[PDB]
Amino acid sequence: QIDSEVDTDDLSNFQL
Amino acid sequence: QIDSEVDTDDLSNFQL
Amino acid sequence: KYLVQNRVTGEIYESAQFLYILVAACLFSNYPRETRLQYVKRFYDAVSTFKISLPTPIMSGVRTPTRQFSSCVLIECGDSLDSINATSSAIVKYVSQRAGIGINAGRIRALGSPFHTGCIPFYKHFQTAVKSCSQGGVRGGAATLFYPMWHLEVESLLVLKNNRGVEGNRVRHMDYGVQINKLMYTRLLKGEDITLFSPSDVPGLYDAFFADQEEFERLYTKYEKDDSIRKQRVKAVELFSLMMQERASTGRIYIQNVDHCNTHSPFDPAIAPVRQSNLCLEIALPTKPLNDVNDENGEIALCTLSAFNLGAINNLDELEELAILAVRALDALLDYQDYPIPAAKRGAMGRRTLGIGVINFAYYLAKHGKRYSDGSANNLTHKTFEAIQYYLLKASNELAKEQGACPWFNETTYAKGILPIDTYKKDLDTIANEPLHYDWEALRESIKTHGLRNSTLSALMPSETSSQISNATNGIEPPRGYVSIKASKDGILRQVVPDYEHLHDAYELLWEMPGNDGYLQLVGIMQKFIDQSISANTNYDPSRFPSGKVPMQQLLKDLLTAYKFGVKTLYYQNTRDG
């Protein structure tokens, strides 16, 4: 199974 | 699981 | 699989060197007498010494009375019954000849549109077309179906191979490719909404999604604001999580970054956009919907494949001769093979698209003392794939001088003097410093002037059969173990990785990788040069994570890493069992 925990603040840093 | 076999004669020797 | 034989009596009629020599003889048979047997000899030498690998249909059929050699077909469905029927008919014809199918069904309008009944019943009909020539509803015939992430029915589409649901909402025996661009990912990063639309309700949106990112954002936000347009709003974090959950559980929900496929592409997206991929996610070619099986205005994309054996070459300059042999052999096959559907002949004769990849990459890295996971192979990979693409382009450019460029060469970025070295994802500059070693400026002018015989030359496919015959590691993938095991009527079939004796410590096995970062950087570096895409895998070992469960955080991180390094597609997700 997978852990559904998503930290959106951790992702908000990323640049595409 | 556990084996329910109890030898009371083996215990009767013990001193508390 | 290979040697000419009688299925019924079990009789075998040839040996391997007769196979190799006659494939060579057939493919080069129309060549002039001054060069003919010279090409035959050199091609024979190349294949018999495992430097070039050919696909099974060629290896089994070239020299025999058959002309069925097309194994890779891409069909785009239009939003009409006539196109749905043409698509289904074309699938049936091709799967009867053993082809894998890429189906674009993203244009089909959503459930409830003023076609009322939606995509899923039509998807079911594509699935039965796909399996129409299969043993018992499964054995034989395979497809991957493509749709945009913003489709109004996407939430229903994402769960189509979830084995726990009602039958009228499940289409489990096709794989799926979800199409994404920068804008979708930005909504994820910002924690905002993604608005879902039926393509029938949003003029120009679908086209712009592939061809023009500025025009997509202008139209998207415009339609988001317009209250008259039917729409559903969902959280970006929720939609992405659902996709990745289904990707993780099935291993067969794929990703196509459609912007990358069109900004970094041999094709001018204003004329010939890349709007889908194939079954295995490495092919990236223009298509056009049919309104009838025999529609002459349609375009079904076809691609002929082969591969260089990176473990069989002593140095990269050997690729000059090998590219000449490979390109010419396959270009000859295009005029040789049969075309059951007019629209597919149109694609093949118009663009003459080829997809030449590699095998034995892991062994190649091992013998150079490099690894996947640590960045140590970055510069070597850059050097290697420069050489591959340079020499492939040089071979096709020279073939064009000799025989003429492809009829639709003018639809390529190549025709405009644009090269993959101009259009790659610039973030790659931060992960490799390897200089170009070949004269791309000269090639640029030579291509613009004399053209290319073939609109595409390179694509990185998976391998199994081909790599087994050369005792090569599979495609670009690290091996799972030192010994491979296959079940056979003749007994347990074992194969040991090439040169285990000397290189066992140099090899990096699949599950020895601490993460996907290093492999994804290597794929990005390859993609700088590759014309089409790469069948890139993601891999996760539950035992490496707390409580034995892979976090959604990491799944999304790797997805975003792939995008940032210009990765065009994502193929299988592998999860270690245990």
Place this chain on the structure above:
Amino acid sequence: KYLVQNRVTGEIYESAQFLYILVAACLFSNYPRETRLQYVKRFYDAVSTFKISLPTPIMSGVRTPTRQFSSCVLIECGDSLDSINATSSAIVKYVSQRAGIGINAGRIRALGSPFHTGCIPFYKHFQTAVKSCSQGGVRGGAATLF
């Protein structure tokens, strides 16, 4: 399912005798003026006094802009891919117009013949063609295969 109405808004536009007289008027519209209204009256009387019954596509549709009135179609499939595809395409077209289908697929060669894979995968394909325009699973599209 008979009276002309707005399915979205719930509005009913006509009443039963207007349906009957107009079905009569449309069906006999191309008759010579010498006999036309005579046929219209007699047909109107026949249907409105229940002596003749007509199918729902005629009853709901004749008088409206639609010309889709076929509800009963029979298609025979030949033993070739071209015919299988033609048959499938024909089904899809007709089931989108609400038709019931009779399919003769008995010509299709058996599993293992010198089409190697047999009848059933193609039967499955005809079923999806039948259900291609149905709610989502079963609701709508009907066929009998022979």
Place this chain on the structure above:
Amino acid sequence: NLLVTKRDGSTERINLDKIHRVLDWAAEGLHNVSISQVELRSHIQFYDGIKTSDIHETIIKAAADLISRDAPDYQYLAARLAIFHLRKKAYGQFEPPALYDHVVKMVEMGKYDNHLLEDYTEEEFKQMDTFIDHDRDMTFSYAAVKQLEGKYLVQNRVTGEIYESAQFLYILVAACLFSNYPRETRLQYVKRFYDAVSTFKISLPTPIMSGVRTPTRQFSSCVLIECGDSLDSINATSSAIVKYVSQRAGIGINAGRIRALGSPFHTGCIPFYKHFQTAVKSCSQGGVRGGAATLFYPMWHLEVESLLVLKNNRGVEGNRVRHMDYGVQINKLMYTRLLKGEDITLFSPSDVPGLYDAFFADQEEFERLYTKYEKDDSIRKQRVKAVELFSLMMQERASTGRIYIQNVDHCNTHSPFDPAIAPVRQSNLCLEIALPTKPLNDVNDENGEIALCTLSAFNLGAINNLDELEELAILAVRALDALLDYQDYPIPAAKRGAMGRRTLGIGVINFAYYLAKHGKRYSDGSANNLTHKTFEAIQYYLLKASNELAKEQGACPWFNETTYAKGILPIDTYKKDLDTIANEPLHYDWEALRESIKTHGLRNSTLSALMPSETSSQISNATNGIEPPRGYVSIKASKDGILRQVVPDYEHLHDAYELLWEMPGNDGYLQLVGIMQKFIDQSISANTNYDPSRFPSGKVPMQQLLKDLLTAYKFGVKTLYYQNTRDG
């Protein structure tokens, strides 16, 4: 290029040399650690525009992922990197501010208690700052830092902001607890206590370590409540439980007095037990998460057969109370019926005048009353076979692991308390606490007594010799005694217990490591004499510290209720069978101490108890309490990754260690517990352990379960805590 986003928001460029230097710093003195390996693994995860905090966390995790038994020093590489990251996150720089500047800022913010600025002058804070060695932050393992970061250090839960570092925690705990001391000794005590805790010689419980220096006064984590046979007492008990569990306390509940089903209270114990369970879990997330209790009853209770099966997961809902643990109370007489293969008669306590009291206080009076009531035909009773009752208990103990034993005779014949005045009639949640209680008739009943105990532990691996315990006992006893006057008391009856008896429970951690470095083991009797010597020293020096505190500040108000007050010592009252398993002589002058105690008293009615540990031992990288480790490497799940901890000094001692499942049986461990109990004031959270694979057909015989139970009794073991069964 690779751009890096700073803490402000500006994009600087990546400094690989600066990262390499920090890693070089963290690697100082460590062996078998590769900096390039850490760099390779983390730098592949770097992307253009990655922010600074993320680079820090990436290399920390990279080091953490390389922790193994072959390379244990990665534990300290990762920790130092984590410590470095925690400094910047709190102070904006590696070097912490001056203590005074730190305290003023923190009081301003409302994170520290303002009494700190009242009780100490700026100049005293300057002086305290000279005691501090911030480089002691470099002595924590990775598991330790994680514990500090998550549970200990003052922080903001919502924003994730961390406000202090570990040495500020240690110095201010010291400063708060010794704040009422006179100026001539004050900062001397502060310095020595600080040194003791910061060098891991003394371990403090989580509520102290997290809360002492902050505005909170909730530090009570261990409460013992006795329920009387009335609705008024049942209601008072429930109310007191609710108040205490809202403050995060573990509960020991004595409900043995509640009359049996069918008594002329008609409906029995179980519905009331259910009500205690909901009181216990009244402040818990979803019916389980938070709040914990162990409930106690005598083996001879009329409802015992129903009570034994309360956490059996296969039964009807109205006969199951599964989310409390249970402690069955037994004495010599019960065991004798087992040995003789006779009956045990069950009674409702309401039907048997004086029986319940005698059960704890007077074994002769118990046997006189028991046999008397057995003969009396007018008394309601049920008879069962002793072999059957014991087997049912041990079956449930084995299946759940959470049916506990209390030998109530041992708890009262070998006890700091005179059982005629202040009998020990229950234990706590974890079975190491053994204190007098009195039922309440109302929440605010001033005649009730709820027992409370403040805990700590000596780190046996951090002391170079046993005489070091003299100073450490002084520090530990005085620090905790000060906490008693410092902490809040939500229930009057609990304040009565704490102020009347001033009970402490100081134990040990790192016992297994201690035995390993002395080349001894649990299972073979080789540690018997060393254990006797060790626990003599612990108890002697604890008593000496409390005796001296009594000279200085006065003995506890209820000192006269102790056996100590009568000139009776644990060395007079221990189970005599211990004489056969150890020959180690007493090394300290107990006769002098005897007279000194009788004359000057003890500040604290109890001093010692052997509790389990997890958090505390992790922070010191110690083995847990007195338990042998299950393996060389411990694993915990974390949002930050897999958390590993390697047993102390694995490199040199891996062969000297005896892992839990390497023990052929429980005999050796039980003898060690018995030897400890000779000296310990309260009890010990003693585990029993069984590996099915060691037994024929893979099943643990009831014969062995009973044998070990009887061995425990014979060596004077007071309680039995968890039964562990190896899975596999």
